[PDB]
């Protein structure tokens, strides 16, 4: 009983290994849909089905998800550590069905159902501090969540509340809780296991890895610091799909890329004498030179708290990997001090 592309075909009230009872769509991807179930056996806890194409490619690919998510369930046993809970797996007639706990919108989908509206800076302070915590433990774990992107982070509840802004006049949304999930471990490797040779979303993607100079964990920290800024304006850091715009946006955003990079990169068709090789005056040249600045000129005030987060930020787009701030060490930024322990 299959799509013509793979996916599973079932409708509102269908049920699965009767057990699962369906109840929405919440949506797709190319690997499947996910849907809202109610489980029977688990007392009728609400879950989020994901369910995947007969595929085998997928279905192969679901298998390592499933193990990484085994993992997390096996280091994380009062689930503290933010990322998201698998509660079962079954293989449904070639169908890889996986079992998480309902969570809400993307912290991506909301940005958007907001026409792009940044998030307030002390949101962007506990969502932040948020995925700091959980890609730690990742990093803890020897592991690295190889795709760290907005749609990757779920809002636990992304109930809002409307005010109209007398000041802008404008009608403002604010999700009343910023609790997250990261979620997705389809991508993710063991420090031990074959890594892929690219890795992650072009705009999330770090220097590293786009000069195939080798990577693990650090190139997380690099996604969590396009995040971050990406919260706080609204827009994406690295708008591109080309390497060399990207590596020389990179430039003009955070300067020159350091020669230590340089000269031990395999590619080397990108750069001439030593440099990167990029004609600011030119029809590429001067569409990077004017749809992007130096980065504290993103800065939309000169508070000491402002001040603090491009701080944050600076220090995970740093080039060199291993001059790139540790997750340990983020959790223990000034820019983390006005939250509240726990
Ligand atoms: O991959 C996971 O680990 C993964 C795990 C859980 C959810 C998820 C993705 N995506 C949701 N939303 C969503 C939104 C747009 C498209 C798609 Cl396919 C899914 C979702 C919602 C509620 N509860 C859990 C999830």
Redesign the pocket.
């Known amino acids: 009983e299959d799509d013509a592309e793979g996916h599973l075909i079932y409708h509102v009230g269908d049920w699965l290994q009767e057990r699962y009872e369906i109840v929405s769509t919440?949506?797709?991807?190319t690997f499947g849909?996910?849907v809202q179930c109610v489980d029977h056996r688990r007392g009728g806890a609400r879950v989020?089905l994901?369910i995947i194409k007969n595929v085998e490619k997928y279905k192969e690919a679901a298998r390592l998800e499933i193990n990484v998510l085994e993992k997390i369930n096996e280091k994380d046993p009062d689930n503290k550590n933010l990322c998201?809970q698998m509660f079962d797996w079954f293989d449904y007639h070639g169908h890889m069905c996986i079992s998480?706990?309902?969570?809400?919108l993307?912290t991506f989908d909301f940005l958007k159902d907001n026409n792009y509206l940044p998030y307030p800076i002390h949101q962007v302070r506990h969502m932040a501090f948020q995925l700091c915590q959980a890609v730690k433990f990742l990093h803890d774990n020897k592991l690295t969540h190889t795709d760290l992107k907005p749609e990757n982070i779920?809002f636990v509840n992304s109930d809002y509340e409307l005010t109209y802004n007398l000041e802008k006049k404008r009608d403002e949304r604010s999700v009343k809780s910023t609790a997250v999930r990261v979620?997705?471990?389809?991508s993710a490797t063991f420090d031990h296991e074959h890594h892929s040779t690219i890795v992650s979303t072009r705009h999330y993607r770090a220097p590293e890895v786009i000069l195939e100079l080798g990577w693990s964990q650090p190139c997380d920290v690099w996604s969590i610091g396009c995040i971050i800024f990406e919260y706080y304006v609204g827009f994406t850091l690295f708008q591109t799909h080309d390497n060399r715009e990207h590596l020389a946006m990179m430039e003009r955003i955070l300067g020159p890329i350091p020669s230590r990079m340089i000269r031990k990169t395999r590619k080397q068709k990108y750069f001439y004498r030593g440099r990167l090789d990029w004609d600011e005056n030119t029809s590429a040249g001067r569409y990077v030179r004017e749809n992007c600045k130096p980065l504290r000129r993103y800065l939309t005030s000169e508070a000491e708290e402002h001040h603090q987060l491009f701080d944050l930020i600076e220090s995970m787009l740093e080039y060199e990997p291993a001059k790139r701030l540790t997750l340990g060490e983020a959790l223990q930024h000034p820019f983390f001090a006005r939250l509240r322990a726990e």
């Open positions: 919440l949506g797709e991807g849909r996910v989020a994901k998201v998480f706990e309902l969570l809400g993307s779920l979620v997705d471990f389809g």
